[PDB]
Amino acid sequence: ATYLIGDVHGCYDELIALLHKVEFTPGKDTLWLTGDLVARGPGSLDVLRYVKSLGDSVRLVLGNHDLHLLAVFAGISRNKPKDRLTPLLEAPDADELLNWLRRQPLLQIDEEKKLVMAHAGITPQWDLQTAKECARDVEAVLSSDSYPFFLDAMYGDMPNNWSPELRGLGRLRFITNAFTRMRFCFPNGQLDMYSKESPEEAPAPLKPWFAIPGPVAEEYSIAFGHWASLEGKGTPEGIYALDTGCCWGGTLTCLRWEDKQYFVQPSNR
Ligand SMILES: [Mn+2]
Ligand SMILES: [Mn+2]
Numbered sequence: 001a002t003y004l005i006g007d008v009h010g011c012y013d014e015l016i017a018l019l020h021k022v023e024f025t026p027g028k029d030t031l032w033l034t035g036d037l038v039a040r041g042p043g044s045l046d047v048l049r050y051v052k053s054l055g056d057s058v059r060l061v062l063g064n065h066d067l068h069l070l071a072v073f074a075g076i077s078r079n080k081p082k083d084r085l086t087p088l089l090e091a092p093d094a095d096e097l098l099n100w101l102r103r104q105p106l107l108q109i110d111e112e113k114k115l116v117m118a119h120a121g122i123t124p125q126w127d128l129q130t131a132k133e134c135a136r137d138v139e140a141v142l143s144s145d146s147y148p149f150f151l152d153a154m155y156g157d158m159p160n161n162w163s164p165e166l167r168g169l170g171r172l173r174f175i176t177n178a179f180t181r182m183r184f185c186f187p188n189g190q191l192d193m194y195s196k197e198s199p200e201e202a203p204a205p206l207k208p209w210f211a212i213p214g215p216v217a218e219e220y221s222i223a224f225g226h227w228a229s230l231e232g233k234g235t236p237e238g239i240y241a242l243d244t245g246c247c248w249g250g251t252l253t254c255l256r257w258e259d260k261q262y263f264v265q266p267s268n269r
Pocket of ligand 1: 007009036063065226243
C-alpha cells in the first residue's frame with residue numbers, strides 16, 4: 001500500500017503511532033513524506049534516523065525547515081532555540097544523517113499513480129518538464145561538495161515571477177521558494193512571500209497557488225505539506241494538503257492512496 005504523511009516536525013512518537021495504526025510494512029508498503037521532518041517537535045534526531053533507515057520504502061521531498069537545518073549545520077545560519085535542533089546537531093551520526101538529507105529530492109513523481117509531490121506544491125507557472133529541470137538543478141547544488149554556498153544564496157524573497165530567462169542566484173532562489181515556501185499567488189501566478197494565513201483570511205487579490213489552473217495540476221494529482229494554516233481543507237479535487245499542524249497541537253495526517261482513506265493521529269502536545 002501507499003501512504004502519504006504531512007509535515008512531521010520532529011513529532012516522532014506521533015509518526016510511529018500513525019504508522020502502527022495503518023500497519024505500515026516496509027517492503028510491502030511505501031511511505032511518501034512531504035518534508036519538514038525536523039524542528040519544533042522534540043524528536044528531530046529520531047525522525048531522521050528512522051526515515052533514513054527506510055531506504056527505498058520512503059519517498060521524501062525536502063521542506064524549508066529541512067533546508068534551514070542544513071544551513072545551521074553548515075554554519076550558514078543561526079540556530080533558533082525554539083527549533084530544538086541541538087540533539088540532532090550534536091549527535092555522533094549528525095554528519096551521516098545530514099549528508100543523507102541533502103541528497104534527497106525536492107520533487108517526487110509517480111507516473112502510474114499520476115501523482116506529484118513537493119513540499120509547498122507546484123507553482124502554476126511551471127509545466128512538468130520545467131518543474132523536473134528546476135528540481136534537478138537545485139538537487140545538484142545540494143548534493144555537491146559546495147552546498148554551503150548554495151544554502152547561503154538561497155535566502156531571499158525575489159524574484160517572485162518565473163521566466164526561463166532567469167539565471168544565476170535569482171533562478172535558484174525562485175526555484176527554492178516555489179518548491180518550499182509557496183502559499184499564495186497573485187492572479188498572474190507570481191509568488192507572495194509574506195502571507196501565511198488561511199485562504200479566507202488573506203488580503204485580495206491573493207489566491208492559493210492551487211486555485212490558479214496550471215498545467216501540472218490539470219494532468220496530475222498534487223500532494224503537499226507546508227501550509228499548516230490551511231488545516232488540510234479547502235482544496236480542489238486532485239489537490240491533497242496533508243499538513244494538519246502536528247507540531248502545533250493539531251494532528252498528523254496519513255492518506256492511503258489506493259482508497260484515498262485518511263488516518264489521523266492527535267498531537268501529544
Ligand atoms: Mn512545516
Ligand atoms: Mn514548510
